[PDB]
Amino acid sequence: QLTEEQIAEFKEAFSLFDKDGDGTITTKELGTVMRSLGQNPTEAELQDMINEVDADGNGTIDFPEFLTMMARKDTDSEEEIREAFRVFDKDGNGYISAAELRHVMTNLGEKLTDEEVDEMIREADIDGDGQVNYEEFVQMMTAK
Ligand SMILES: CC[C@]1(O)C[C@@H]2CN(CCc3c([nH]c4ccccc34)[C@@](C(=O)OC)(c3cc4c(cc3OC)N(C)[C@@H]3[C@]45CCN4CC=C[C@@](CC)(C[C@@]36OC(=O)N(CCCl)C6=O)[C@H]45)C2)C1
Ligand SMILES: [Ca+2]
Ligand SMILES: [Ca+2]
Ligand SMILES: [Ca+2]
Ligand SMILES: [Ca+2]
């Protein structure tokens, strides 16, 4: 079984995509999340993304399909991660600061405590400057 904290983290993640809270993720919803991350997918591209994990074949992503999508770098290519790094690196100085990380996560719909932002940074920060450079960001986004 999961812990409830695990389930909660999964629900939070899902909630970021399922904006209207009807329990499914549409191409519309997937598209607004991808765009928020600096991408510009086509309707057809979004539908393909959904198709890959659409096990019940209803055209949208439900919770369990979302979990499988989560567990599975075609998406998360270099283009996509550079675009995402840009979103996070708000002043364009080449480093994601704690302030920038927190801000952006909040913008995306995630609400992080100071401890969580701290930990996120610390677990990503290889060279110990308290900031996340591009290569660190890559590892952080493709972790697990
Ligand atoms: C390079 C472009 C990119 O879109 C960038 C992200 C990942 N991916 C694929 C999309 C994605 C994100 N979240 C998902 C959940 C399920 C399926 C796909 C996704 C995606 C997103 O947009 O969230 C809505 C994402 C995923 C992760 C993320 C941040 C993040 O952006 C907000 N982390 C800090 C990780 C993580 C990335 C690494 N990891 C693999 C396994 C689990 C988690 C998923 C919950 C754990 C993570 O760690 C963590 O503490 N949290 C919560 C605090 Cl934020 C996380 O979300 C994800 C967007 C590539
Ligand atoms: Ca929905
Ligand atoms: Ca489905
Ligand atoms: Ca910066
Ligand atoms: Ca660093």
Swiss-Prot record:
Q: Where along this sequence does the record place binding of Ca(2+) 1?
A: 18, 20, 22, 24, 29
Residues involved in Ca(2+) 2 binding: 54, 56, 58, 60, 65
Q: Which amino acid positions bind Ca(2+) 3, per UniProt?
A: 89, 91, 93, 95, 100
Q: Annotated cross-link Glycyl lysine isopeptide (Lys-Gly) (interchain with G-Cter in SUMO2) - which positions?
A: 19
| Residue stretches making up the EF-hand domain | 5-40, 41-74, 76-111, 112-144
GO biological process terms held by the UniProt record: regulation of release of sequestered calcium ion into cytosol by sarcoplasmic reticulum
Q: What protein name applies here?
A: Calmodulin
Instruction: Write down any Gene Ontology CC term.
Output: cytosol
Tree of life domain: Eukaryota
For the cross-link Glycyl lysine isopeptide (Lys-Gly) (interchain with G-Cter in ubiquitin), the position is 19
Tell me which PROSITE patterns the record gives.
Answer: EF_HAND_1 (PS00018), EF_HAND_2 (PS50222)
Any notes on this protein's domains?
Answer: The N-terminal and C-terminal lobes of CALM bind to the C-terminus of KCNQ1 in a clamp-like conformation. Binding of CALM C-terminus to KCNQ1 is calcium-independent but is essential for assembly of the structure. Binding of CALM N-terminus to KCNQ1 is calcium-dependent and regulates electrophysiological activity of the channel. The C-lobe interacts with KCNN4 channels in a calcium-independent manner, whereas the N-lobe interacts with the S4-S5 linker of KCNN4 in a calcium-dependent manner playing a role as calcium sensor and gating the channel.
For the modification N6-methyllysine, which residues carry it? 111
Q: Which InterPro entries match?
A: CALM/Myosin/TropC-like, EF-hand-dom_pair, EF_Hand_1_Ca_BS, EF_hand_dom
Which family does the entry's similarity section mention? Belongs to the calmodulin family.
- Residues noted as binding Ca(2+) 4 in the record, renumbered to the chain: 125, 127, 129, 131, 136
Q: Which residues carry this modification: Phosphotyrosine?
A: 95, 134
Question: Anything further noted?
Answer: This protein has four functional calcium-binding sites.
Localization per record: Cytoplasm; Cytoplasm, Cytoskeleton, Spindle; Cytoplasm, Cytoskeleton, Spindle pole
Where, if anywhere, are coiled coils annotated? none
Locate the N6-acetyllysine modifications and list their residues: 19, 90
A molecular function annotated in GO for this UniProt entry is: calcium ion binding
Which is one Pfam family of this protein? EF-hand_7
